[PDB]
Amino acid sequence: DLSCRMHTCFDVYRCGFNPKNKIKVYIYAISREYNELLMAISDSDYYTDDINRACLFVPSIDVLNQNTLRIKETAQAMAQLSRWDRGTNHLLFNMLPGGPPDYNTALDVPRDRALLAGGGFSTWTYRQGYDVSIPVYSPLSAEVDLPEKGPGPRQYFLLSSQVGLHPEYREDLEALQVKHGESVLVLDKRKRCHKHQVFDYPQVLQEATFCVVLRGARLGQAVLSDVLQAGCVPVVIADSYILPFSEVLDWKRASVVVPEEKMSDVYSILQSIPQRQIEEMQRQARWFWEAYFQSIKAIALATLQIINDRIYPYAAISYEEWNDPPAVKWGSVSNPLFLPLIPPQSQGFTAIVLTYDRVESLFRVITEVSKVPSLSKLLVVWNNQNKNPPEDSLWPKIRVPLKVVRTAENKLSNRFFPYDEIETEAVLAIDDDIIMLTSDELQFGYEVWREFPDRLVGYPGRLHLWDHEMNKWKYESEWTNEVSMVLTGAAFYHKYFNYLYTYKMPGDIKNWVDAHMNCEDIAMNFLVANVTGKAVIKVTPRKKFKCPTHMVERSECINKFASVFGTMPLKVVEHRADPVLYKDDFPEKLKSFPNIGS
């Protein structure tokens, strides 16, 4: 029944909510492909033994092949399953939905309400949020392991390798071949022959840039998996057909679809695709093959994941987790603070000051930070467990709240804890020996942070360089025309970065920095560049921060951190954000920040 959607057909009384947002699948106690599918489902986390606690029922009946189905007997068995209950939450897998009399592009069994996962779906036989479109599994994907050919130019531009196409398709393809020649390599009747010349059928597909996929019957051909494996960008010229896993996969980035009527102009369409897009489409096709088309296990897992995402929409995996290749995933960013919002100056920032035996200079920090107009709250992290904070009469009188937090352990990570006492978005993490920053400089730093609230706006200027002689990264601190790090001696950053340091920093970087009591700013910059994807922004020309075996440790820190991340997430820029009208022949009163100079 086509009028069968989740909100009415599906019975959500069976899987309401679980701490792990994974639906449960039960399998009743036969082609080898279906045996492999059942084995793949059984070894997954979705498998459960209790019938009562299950939400999806997958019968142990072969429905992939319809040429030898005996539809009446299969329907009788489906009814006889003794738990059919009008097919409320049952799932059926299919790959050849067609009939010798006529091909309906769907399974011909009654299946009054059951979920269907079939290879061939038209937009008329498809229920949007109910059915799932699965690839037509090709045994050639695993039978022959084609070498992983790198993306690049190919001998042929357009190619078509299908047997028994309709005569109109053959006529159009031959017309294209005679119109262009030496590029459109149309092939005819596991080996292909053009004209007395033989190509290896799995491997000829590796010799072409674009590959033609047509519809002869069942609306979905097994050649799509082979085309994806060979890496060529598939061209589907089926008029009304939805590509497998179109719900979660972005086929616009991995294929070209042209209508059957507009087939004679396919070459002009394909020539409009730039070569870079061709390489990206080839990479996406290979990724789709190795992640979803490779084996019956991958298809079954993808189907179960899609259905689980339908059942638990709030816990569905991301688009990038679906259609980004692992190389792209390592190179991707997925910035968490992406919304282009400019926080108002009515709010302010919270200053976290980490002090350790600098009481005389600490009050100087308090009276220097407190002079800025936009300070909201001052927070001091007393990290010394042997000396108590001075008397509350000794603390200076300031316009904003000041509170002191005792730390049970001596760690450099105590600066980066997400304290609930911080109510604002911005954090000014400043060391206890930072006095040279004027009020206007701090205000300018905050103002620049408002325009760039997803980065690390620091005042220290650092760099890292590559030592060719030693084949290792080298920490740099000399005044150079390149910045890769801004130290947390004076850093504006989102409190989400504190949360990330405390609960998401990869490896034992937090533990290692705590152990060695060094290199916390480097780790923070590394995390910010890894999660945000864009380099830090250094502000002001000021470089000196002290009015009155460590460096090799910093180099070792950089090397270890690069080892942990597996790459250098840091980026090199030459951005010294300055106030506009800086050092101009303008009156000082009208300037926004006429107190920056070093």
Binding site: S240, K252, Q277, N335, L337, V448, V483, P579, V580, L581
Partner: protein
């Protein structure tokens, strides 16, 4: 096509593709008869289509027809319902059984058993209905539009509500609701069970039974208690103090509460089962809203508490983006509908899901330019791609080449010496003929000269096929630069490709003494416009200026021979929602009617956009060690100070 020419209509059967058959995809609106009452909402929809770039006056050229009859309200009891519509639309000569017709509808159904009674026989026309159930929605044919009132802005924007993004992303409450409950009829089942989940601490579900005028007759014991608590809390103050805003089903599947939930930054938890969410064909709603089944109403607080902080942060930001991009005003909605229709004609020219569900959005990303995501300045981070290292220089010449000392010559060689330049294009828009080939000084990069067919200021922003780099260094004839300045600007652009990187910063402001926008060029402590006279920007903005903007604005720009840079900055700040980047301390990059024309242009552009998309910023990107007391042998960009 004969079998499925009915309720099963699709775009490949009940839609004639041959009528567009070109890059020109036009929409036609029937004339109004000056004898029928028209609701303000349908009039706003019509005005938004007519003011669009899809609007044409020729029924032969267009491939999309819009009725002038009000089909928004089909409730027979509604005051805006129009009687005798079936015969009135069947008598139209261009109807053709409604083959390429878009019908806008917001309400349908009478008092008992509200259904999709559109009134007349639509035939083959795809209806952009508001509250569409899932089983009555044609997937690749119909467009599910939001339900909006008559007060929805025509062209402006509410600009969201989330002005702070603070962690943890939680607020005072967790679920909120305040709306009427119906004691008789259909559609109040999900609203009569909210007292079960209501707890009063973080799950506050308020209802009132006062509906119509006879609500007192059917009231029960519970209504007295519930109505007392109704006045305790304010609805507007309640949506702004909840991480999640419950959006249940009223009489119909949709409601005004969805858009208010999106605007208030609270992630909507929709309890309307079988609701095709607005623009669901292009928008992934798992990223901006929580879809809760009506049957599992008691488990809603548990499933809500199970949501993690990162998921909530993403959901809030995504719902704010969706509001600001697609649902903010009526023009946004109708343009989104038209573009969703357009993407279904040429499949190889379409917006991938990464375009709709990410900044800047599908409105500002036109696949007719390129379907490759790397050809846009917004998706570099989402891929593993770095900005291209080469740029193309376009020089706008309006004066004849009479002497070898003219600034256009020294500027052409200056850009060539840069290690990043790929080529130079000299747009010769002068009355005199083209100069001799030997007059061009020898350069490492090729130089291509194009004589403009139409000598208008909008020709400098055309998408020329001679530009082989994604970056464009746009210079005027009187632009004075050094190679170091170009190198620095391009390097700074390499970190911010989606913006405009240039020297001459100009600002805008509001003049209360005249109640209008004002253009400022004096040295101010802040800027929001850097002119295109010397600026680096992605070449997709050329296509955007050429196509996206209306013909009226570009024609006015051509007529006054001004305001091209202002309009470009308007478009860039609108697409990016970010301020432009000004680099270095360059205050003058050159050497009363101009200012008035610029200010009138600014007001006109603000009127067309519906708001001011320009955003202030008081920072500039200067080189490290600029005017710093270091030995001059260590700096890289020495000549910038000179």
């Amino acid at each position: 096509s004969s079998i499925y020419k009915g309720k099963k209509c699709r775009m490949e059967s009940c839609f004639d593709f041959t009528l567009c058959k070109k890059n020109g995809f036009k929409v036609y609106v029937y004339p109004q008869q000056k004898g029928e009452k028209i609701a303000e909402s349908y009039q706003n929809i019509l005005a938004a289509i007519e003011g669009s770039r899809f609007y044409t006056s020729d029924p032969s050229q267009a491939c999309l027809f819009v009725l002038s009859l009000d089909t928004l309200d089909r409730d027979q009891l509604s005051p805006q319902y129009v009687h005798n519509l079936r015969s009135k639309v069947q008598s139209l000569h261009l109807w053709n059984n409604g083959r390429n017709h878009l019908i806008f509808n917001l309400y349908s159904g009478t008092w008992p058993d509200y259904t999709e009674d559109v009134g007349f026989d639509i035939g083959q026309a795809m209806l952009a209905k508001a509250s569409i159930s899932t089983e009555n929605f044609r997937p690749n044919f119909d467009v599910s539009i939001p339900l909006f009132s008559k007060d929805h802005p025509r062209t402006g924007g509410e600009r969201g509500f989330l002005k702070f993004n603070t962690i943890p992303p939680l607020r005072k409450y967790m679920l909120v609701f305040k709306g009427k409950r119906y004691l008789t009829g259909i559609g109040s089942d999900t609203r009569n069970a909210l007292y079960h989940v209501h707890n009063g601490e973080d799950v506050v579900l308020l209802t009132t039974c006062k509906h119509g005028k006879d609500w007192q007759k059917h009231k029960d014991s519970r209504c007295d208690r519930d109505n007392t608590e109704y006045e305790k809390y304010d609805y507007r103050e309640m949506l702004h103090n909840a991480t999640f805003c419950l959006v249940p089903r009223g009489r119909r599947l949709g409601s005004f509460r969805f858009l208010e939930a999106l605007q208030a930054a609270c992630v909507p938890v929709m309890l309307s089962n079988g609701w095709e969410l607005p623009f669901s064909e292009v928008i992934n709603w798992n990223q901006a809203a929580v879809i809760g089944d009506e049957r599992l109403l008691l488990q809603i607080p548990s499933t809500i508490r199970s949501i993690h902080q990162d998921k909530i942060l993403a959901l809030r930001q995504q719902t704010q983006f969706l509001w600001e991009a697609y649902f903010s005003s009526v023009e946004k909605i109708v343009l989104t509908t038209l573009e969703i229709i357009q993407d279904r004609i040429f499949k190889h020219i379409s917006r991938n899901s990464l375009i709709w569900n990410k900044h800047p959005g599908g409105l500002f990303v036109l696949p007719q330019y390129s379907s490759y995501l790397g050809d846009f300045p917004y998706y570099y981070a989402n891929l593993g791609l770095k900005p291209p290292s080469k740029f193309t220089a376009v020089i706008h010449a309006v004066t004849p080449l009479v002497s070898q000392s003219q600034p256009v010559l020294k500027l052409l060689v200056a850009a060539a010496k840069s290690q990043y330049c790929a080529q130079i294009i000299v747009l010769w828009n002068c009355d005199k003929p083209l100069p001799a080939k030997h007059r061009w000084p020898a350069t490492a990069v090729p130089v291509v000269v194009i004589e403009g067919e139409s000598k208008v200021m909008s020709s400098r922003f055309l998408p020329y096929d001679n530009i082989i780099t994604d970056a464009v260094l746009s210079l005027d004839e009187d632009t004075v630069l050094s190679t170091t300045e170009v190198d620095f600007a391009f390097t700074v652009w390499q970190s911010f490709p989606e913006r405009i990187v240039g020297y001459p910063a100009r600002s805008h402001f509001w003049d209360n003494s005249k109640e209008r926008w004002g253009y400022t060029s004096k040295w101010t402590n802040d800027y929001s416009m850097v002119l295109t006279g010397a600026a680096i920007y992605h070449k997709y903005y050329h296509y955007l200026y050429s196509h996206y903007l209306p013909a009226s604005l570009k024609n006015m720009v051509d007529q006054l021979a001004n305001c091209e840079d202002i309009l470009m900055n308007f478009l860039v700040s609108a697409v990016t929602k970010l301020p432009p980047i000004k680099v270095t301390q360059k205050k003058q990059y050159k050497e009363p009617d101009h200012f008035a024309q610029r200010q009138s242009c600014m007001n006109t552009f603000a009127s067309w956009f519906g708001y001011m998309p320009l955003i202030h910023s008081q920072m500039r990107l200067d080189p490290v060690l600029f005017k710093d007391q270091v030995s001059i042998l260590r700096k890289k960009y020495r000549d910038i100070e000179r």
